[PDB]
Symmetry: C4
Subunit: 357 residues, 4 copies
């Protein structure tokens, strides 16, 4: 077997060390634009998010309401594919024809929307999603290091060339990244085991600390870019617990972030808002739960947070403020200048409130 | 004294990183056969289990019912030797003559069964077990790095040559492995302190993290094979808490796994099924407890799990699925291709369900 | 991004190993004097504290009463600047004209006092503080690695030359130290995230273990001194939980220590003494709490400790005793001779009371 | 300041890995004799304990009854010196004249006994203890790296030559050992902060993990022996929680072990046996508690264990059994052959009972 020199680490084990903050860096001047799909050296991506957040490919997260609400703020949603082809295409169509500052739209001013696909019924599902107006697709899987994803991407390329964009994943190391890169993926998703509703141990025991996974994949992605001139955006998927984890993921090299729990708490998520003992909650279940995969996972509740807009603004304002502490006005600048330290196992306590009531 | 460069680690500190999964790897095509006794380069073992699981040499685990139930699924039980010679031989005889898909049997279609022996009354116990029809024997001890085991194996070789198979142990490092290998053991058992009912600290303070023990012994076993052309199967004994620990043990190099608690929960274990406050439990005590060694250990209860068959199928289906994630269709292929990472002390939390009710 | 070879550590992870204690080292012979502002090689600081403790620039800590009480014992307070310019100058004036063994005073025998300033209204606030009689100033910020601090110090130098002393901060590494050193700071404050009422994670995720921060900054400060002949005193700000942490901070190289919670517990702090369920407490809130910054932080209570005098004497007696264990009669000697070890993550338990009721 | 490459570790972080156990190693053949005072290469110590245990220099542990009970089993007690010179000499006299298999006695068949002394009144206390018949003395201090101990030992040598034996300590590193070795100590005590009733953090913050301290001192002691031909026995004082910690301390190089809590639980300790809510306890307080030092520490209770004899036999039987697992028939052989591993921070759980009720 193959072993590694260091153990893997998660986002909670890292902190950012400030860099020189100049007079021109104030939160309002920070640009959070980021590429969504691959491009060549010297070019710009054909699709750029206005904010680095995308909603998870989950029944309890990315419905039509979510897709519209997020696109309005500059991000994009990936309508879940764990439903009939007709039902998914209907949601995509509804988002693209909803209009019949930071909004993410196409040349026709329609909100952009993505859709998840599987390695099984893609020959029928992909055409339907394309006709419905899907702007980008993404193969939804816990282990993207599979010949099945290569086959799926291959079929798409042979039928649509590079006109149809498709992300692939998930992978957690350089080898997995390279395999999907060579396969033709437009963006690669990183993360196995980090999800809030994913209990690795009680399952297959496959995974890797999210921080280590991102750092490793990003190194391989940068090596790949230098070798081929092709820049492939990567997505840190899962493991975001606190707002600063967003800043860390981006600083470590991720172009954008995929979140489930974070968005499930909003009014726009497709789940039911239920009031339990005085506390308004929202349902949240993983795609691996029996409650979903049958149309491996856990079913739960998340505290109601209200409308997406206000929460995203608050989260990103903190990200922007932190970026200025690090001397960065853009994500690429943050990825270049960030100083990231690991924190001791025997600590973390000093970081939070201590010795006070 | 002699010290080591790194601290020892247990199974809970590791995770598997996926490899390339090909279209031909589906759980149903995975072969879990594995060698039980030593053989020379170019040969196959005289005894191959159909599944890599064997039941512990314990009064509360391996009785005749267990031996039949496990052999039926492809594994083998080691009838406890902590009973009279006549009583143990009777159980072996009963299993071998019970018949008077994955079943593990001899050339006469009779279920295979093993039996534990001690370094004290072997001159009388071994002959009885052989006559009763025992297919394999195993010296039962917490510290197999003993001249007593060499003497026992020597007596068996001098009286039966290589016709009677005998495992030895337990050891936790290369030196212990080599000593028993040179002594003539047919397979060597690994593990001291990892058992669920073994409290190292409150005892002698001897032991080693199970993962480190397996990894070290396997390295020595492979070195031994290259030097002598002799391949000696090794058994990871104890420390299995979750199904994925099985996959890890095998990936680290163990040919098969010995479990106590896992099997004690089944209907076929020889202990009493007792109902406590609405919960059906099964008794489970270690061989070191006063309740047993007198015909150092703890006496306890384990949740009733039902029939062995359904539980083993579920566990192994998960192992097979994980093997496919790692690109392995067989155990030897898994041992060659597995990518195994240690996880941070400051983590493991991200791995399970978090920040959700 | 830039990474580090080792994770950061906090004070609780360290212990001091005794050195040779001579017959002349008794607590009463220990000198705790220390420089407050920069000077050149061969010179002495223009301001030397008689004890290495200064009170935090906080509304709930450094009022006029605190400043007088601390100066009387040899330390200095930094009157909070989170109030009107007129109100702050009034407190400074009151301390300087209060008289109208270890007392810290000027050439006119008046108690010394400091005052915090911000990078916004300094053109008006600084002149007022100078006229009021402020002996030293200090820019109050969580991230001192800013062009704003360079501008502020520059304005002060251009208007007052080196006659007005001004500390800057906070920083946590060599780069931040060097930036403020070159900018002209008279002393540099170290620490981000360590404060008792600062919850890093629930904020920006910026910071560094206090011990590592001090050690790193001190190394850079010593390198700077060797290069330029300029010695810049540094202050360890925040993270002090136990008295021995004071000894550690000083041993690691800090010239003095800034504390908030420690002083808030005293009768002289400007907060209200409230009795809760039989326990007398004192209010304590961070400068980042809404309760303060509006004239990011937490509001709380700290156990009443009584008068400052008796508590400081007790704390420093322990520091002096420990210094003698280390063979040091002065702080510089402690910084040169201290033997400091990190303690295992798997321990710390042996250090406290254990296995006894 | 001086730093170290590795953090310090405690006994709970280590486990012993078995070595070859021969047929001649059974508990009853294990010899636990060990030297108490220094000797030259090729010689034997003038005083050899029959068991490697000595009772702490504490009011709540080593009284006349304890000294007699322990000497009867082969160990020695150090009558506390935190009492009047007359009172301490009386206890020593009573033990030496009490008679007016493994018993530790002098040439006159009288039980051996030790006595603690301080660096203050030794000019009067030492003569009294010598006349009373003390067999060995030991300077009692938390930080033995002091000129005061050198002076004390010097006075003893000048007045009695090498006829009066005197141990010194405590120290935790090679430098401290060497200082006391050159000063003339007959044996050196190791340990600061490990005591069960010693709360390092709430005090001076001085100390070192006991395991690391012993290992380091032993290395220096062996280097010293090779340089001068003088072998100085060392004592591991404090930190023993479990019986196996005894085996570890000895395996790491300590010639004998000093314990407080362990002995306080016995009928022979001088404290009161009190019954609390159905549980018989014994009082136990440190020498640093106000309750003692006035004729820094904690006052507590320890579960009654009964007579010393039966408990010591049980503890040492386990030590002997473990020694045989390691292939050692004597302490020196154990120190030469022991294989000692550190255990992961993320573990230790596997070592104890787990996943069972
Ligand atoms: N285990 C499951 O049932 C399940 N369902 C979704 N997921 C993963 O978790 C991610 C969401 O993580 P989180 O809630 O944001 O921490 C998804 O984008 C996906 O990669 N896991
Ligand atoms: N300490 C005891 O009393 C005792 N009895 C059995 N054992 C060990 O524990 C193993 C079972 O571990 P577990 O229950 O499967 O974790 C046995 O195969 C044996 O090696 N230990
Ligand atoms: N986060 C806040 O609201 C806040 N207010 C003050 N502080 C920091 O905490 C320090 C006090 O730390 P402590 O209470 O002594 O641990 C201050 O000197 C300052 O650097 N932080
Ligand atoms: N801190 C105290 O008040 C005190 N009193 C005794 N001690 C130390 O603790 C040792 C006993 O440790 P323990 O109880 O056996 O863990 C003593 O031999 C001594 O070195 N410490
Ligand atoms: K900055
Ligand atoms: K795979
Ligand atoms: K000392
Ligand atoms: K052995
Ligand atoms: Na904090
Ligand atoms: Na998880
Ligand atoms: Na302690
Ligand atoms: Na165990």
């Amino acid at each position: 077997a193959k072993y590694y020199n260091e153990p893997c680490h998660t986002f909670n084990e890292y902190l950012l060390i400030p860099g020189l903050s100049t007079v021109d860096c104030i939160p309002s001047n920070v640009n959070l634009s980021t590429p969504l799909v691959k491009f060549q050296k010297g070019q710009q991506s054909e699709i750029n998010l206005k904010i680095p957040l995308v909603s998870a490919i989950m029944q309890s997260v990315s419905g039509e309401k979510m897709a519209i609400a997020l696109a309005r703020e500059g991000g994009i949603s990936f309508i879940f594919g764990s439903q009939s082809i007709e039902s998914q295409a209907a949601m995509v169509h509804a988002v693209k024809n909803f209009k019949a500052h930071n909004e993410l739209v196409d040349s026709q001013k329609r909100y952009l929307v993505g859709a998840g696909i599987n390695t099984r019924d893609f020959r029928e599902r992909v055409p339907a999603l394309v006709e419905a107006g899907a702007d980008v697709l993404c193969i939804d899987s816990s282990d993207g290091f599979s010949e099945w994803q290569k086959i799926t991407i291959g079929w798409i390329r042979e039928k649509y060339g590079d006109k149809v964009k498709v992300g692939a994943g998930n992978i957690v190391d350089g080898e997995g990244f390279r395999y999907l890169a060579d396969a033709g993926a437009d963006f690669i998703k990183i993360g196995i085991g980090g999800g809030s509703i994913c209990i690795t141990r009680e399952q297959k025991g496959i995974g890797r600390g999210q921080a280590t996974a991102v750092i490793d994949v990003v190194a391989e992605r940068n090596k790949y870019f230098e070798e081929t001139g092709i820049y492939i955006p990567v997505c840190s998927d899962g493991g975001i617990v606190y707002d600063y984890h967003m800043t860390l993921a981006l600083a470590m090299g991720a172009d954008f972030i995929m979140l489930g729990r974070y968005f499930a708490r909003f009014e726009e998520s497709p789940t039911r808002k239920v009031t339990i003992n005085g506390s308004v909650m929202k349902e949240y279940w993983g795609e691996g739960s029996s409650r979903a995969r049958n149309w491996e996972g856990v079913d739960s509740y998340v505290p109601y947070a209200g409308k997406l807009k206000d929460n995203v603004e608050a989260s990103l304002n903190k990200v922007k403020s932190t970026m200025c502490n690090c001397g960065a006005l853009t994500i690429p600048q943050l990825q270049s200048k960030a100083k990231i330290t690991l924190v001791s196992s025997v600590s973390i306590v000093e970081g939070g409130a201590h010795d006070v009531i």
